Design a protein around this ligand. Structure first.
Ligand SMILES: NC(=O)c1ccc[n+]([C@@H]2O[C@H](COP(=O)([O-])OP(=O)(O)OC[C@H]3O[C@@H](n4cnc5c(N)ncnc54)[C@H](O)[C@@H]3O)[C@@H](O)[C@H]2O)c1
Ligand SMILES: NC(=O)c1ccc[n+]([C@@H]2O[C@H](COP(=O)([O-])OP(=O)(O)OC[C@H]3O[C@@H](n4cnc5c(N)ncnc54)[C@H](O)[C@@H]3O)[C@@H](O)[C@H]2O)c1
Ligand SMILES: O=c1ccn([C@@H]2O[C@H](COP(=O)(O)OP(=O)(O)O)[C@@H](O)[C@H]2O)c(=O)[nH]1
Ligand SMILES: O=c1ccn([C@@H]2O[C@H](COP(=O)(O)OP(=O)(O)O)[C@@H](O)[C@H]2O)c(=O)[nH]1
Lengths: 309, 310
């Protein structure tokens, strides 16, 4: 039915997560039909209200039968693979099961169901310790943590599908219900008058609105396929992040090593994504950090505030 | 120097040749295998040799095996590959199986774990011979699952040696171009050579580095095992042709490789020579001739055992 001529029946694995839920808040108001499959390892049941257009199956991407049944009942036109395990770095079996096996299961099921487009999200940890920053899209994958290793094989399997597949390697996405990392940590701790530390690292940050726009483009029939970096292409230090928070909150911070497994600089080159999609990120660094903080002022550092009615 | 060796995949080509090398030495060996590709005939009921039929994907069975047998040493030689569209099995055996073996070895505090790795981990290399510090870049089910598996093994607290291998020839090799040219030439069938370059390694050179890899205080990490020299399939064909004595009715066509047939896969073994002091002794001609001599005695078979059964 609606949007007229481009209604999506969208199967989102990992839909109770940060990215999934934001995507849902973006697409459900437009009239798309969404089915979520989540096991609530990190995702919250509170971000999926019983609203029209939205169905939820509590389940794993590792469960191939649950997937065949969901894909058969629902008949998606489009798939967003957003399920990832990561929370216990020593539980390699879970990471392999979710991130590799779950990806293979989503890919085989998608293929059989004849989906039009599949959208995967990749971690920049796939790049390990890069030789060239900003990291070019044709850089080698070189992970050295469980999450990086399993995610890297997951993506590589997806890229063997006959289903058209877009895999976006992402900058740290800021937006509603981000409750981990330096931004909420400095906000909370500065407001509490606690000592903060800045790792001497460079990272890149992406506003939710820019993530939403490349996600939209990625699911359009006929658009490019393959692996793509999603970023402004600009890097900012953790100290720089801390500086925006301090100023915003209204309150001499030490700058320290690079811990062992803490990659000194991670910034992605988006140029090929700009070329093939006509996409460019609009919101700059200060507006990106400030908008996350503004959200914390309204709802607090929480992952359970729903913008759905 | 007595080893209690747990060898996953011991019924296959590498596993069984290793067992025939080590069992006469008084070593104690437990084989875990599911017989997907490897054969039951290569594992006679002999003193020193135990066989558990099972999967490396079975975490229960591995835990029970490492507990009862208490290995000092692990050789992870189990791999799935036969159906390139069966990604689930490849991921199950090669990634989950490797994690299971790694965790179990770590828990049992084994001294040394030895892994074998396919040169498909390198995908399409930028430089040939392939340097050890080259990126992994697999694009097939086998290569991607194996790449992830090796990477997990590398995160173990056990000392790990992962050997990236040239094509190993020896007892019971019954796949690839060598047995295919041998069989077809003797039967008067037309052969095709793709226009590819590969490396080949005699069993005796493989046995020598495997030995070194399981010695305490030896180097750890990833290593290329090879002579470092590359030979086309056409060169392989010529050795077989000459050896077999056949007369050709037509000159063999050399055809361009498929899209997924990597044109040149030769490994640079130089860090291995530096750190182990190992060097392959058997040249190309002798490597190929040695395989064909073995075929002449036993035929192209993967069920002939060199172990004396009671
Ligand atoms: N948010 C980012 O800045 C960022 C950066 C790089 C990559 N990514 C990728 O984007 C995706 C979403 O990330 P996020 O930030 O929303 O993380 P998240 O933890 O908020 O969401 C992942 C969701 O997957 C679910 N999940 C875990 N295992 C599952 C399984 N077996 N079956 C079904 N669901 C399962 C969790 O319950 C969770 O809701 C992940 O794949 C992640 O690797 C995100
Ligand atoms: N032969 C070579 O030149 C070569 C080259 C590169 C890499 N390797 C690697 O060396 C190892 C041995 O190779 P091979 O040449 O002996 O192949 P092979 O097929 O003869 O043996 C693999 C063995 O593993 C067994 N197996 C498969 N799945 C299993 C599982 N779930 N649990 C337990 N056993 C399982 C098979 O039955 C088989 O006996 C593999 O890891 C392979 O990737 C070999
Ligand atoms: O209180 C904090 C929390 C985050 N970090 C750093 O912020 C970066 C964000 O990377 P992450 O792994 O969190 O993604 C890393 O370099 C961390 O070391 C920091 O310096 N101080
Ligand atoms: O009859 C044959 C069999 C093998 N090959 C080639 O030999 C190489 C090694 O074979 P593998 O089985 O490893 O693949 C590859 O380049 C194959 O294309 C060939 O040209 N003709």
């Amino acid at each position: 039915l609606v949007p007229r001529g481009s209604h999506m029946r969208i199967l989102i694995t990992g839909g109770a997560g940060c990215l999934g839920s934001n995507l849902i808040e973006h697409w459900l108001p437009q009239g798309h039909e969404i089915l979520v499959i989540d096991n609530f390892a990190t995702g919250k049941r509170e971000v999926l209200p019983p609203v029209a257009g939205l169905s939820v199956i509590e389940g794993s991407v590792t469960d191939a039968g649950l997937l065949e049944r969901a894909f058969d009942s629902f008949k998606p036109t489009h798939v967003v693979h957003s399920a990832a395990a990561y929370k216990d770095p020593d539980d390699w079996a879970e990471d392999a099961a979710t991130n590799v096996q779950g990806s293979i299961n989503v890919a085989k099921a998608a293929s059989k169901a004849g989906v039009k487009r599949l959208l995967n999200f990749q971690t920049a940890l796939c790049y390990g310790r890069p030789a060239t920053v900003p990291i070019p899209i044709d850089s080698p994958t070189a992970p050295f943590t469980s999450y990086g290793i399993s995610k890297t094989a997951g993506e590589a399997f997806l890229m063997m599908s006959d289903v058209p597949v877009v895999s976006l390697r992402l900058a740290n996405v800021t937006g509603p219900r981000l409750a981990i990392g330096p931004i909420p940590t400095f906000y909370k701790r500065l407001k509490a008058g606690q000592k903060c530390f800045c790792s001497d690292t460079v990272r890149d940050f992406l506003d939710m609105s820019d993530f939403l726009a490349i996600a939209d483009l990625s699911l359009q029939e006929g658009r490019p396929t393959g692996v793509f970096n999603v970023s402004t292409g600009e890097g900012h230090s953790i100290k720089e992040v801390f500086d925006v928070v301090l100023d915003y909150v209204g309150a001499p911070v030490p700058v320290v090593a690079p811990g062992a497994d803490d990659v000194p600089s991670v910034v992605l080159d988006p140029s090929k994504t700009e070329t093939e999609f006509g996409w460019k990120a609009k919101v700059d660094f200060k507006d990106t950090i400030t908008g996350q903080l503004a959200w914390y002022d309204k709802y607090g550092v929480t992952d359970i505030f729903s913008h759905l009615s």
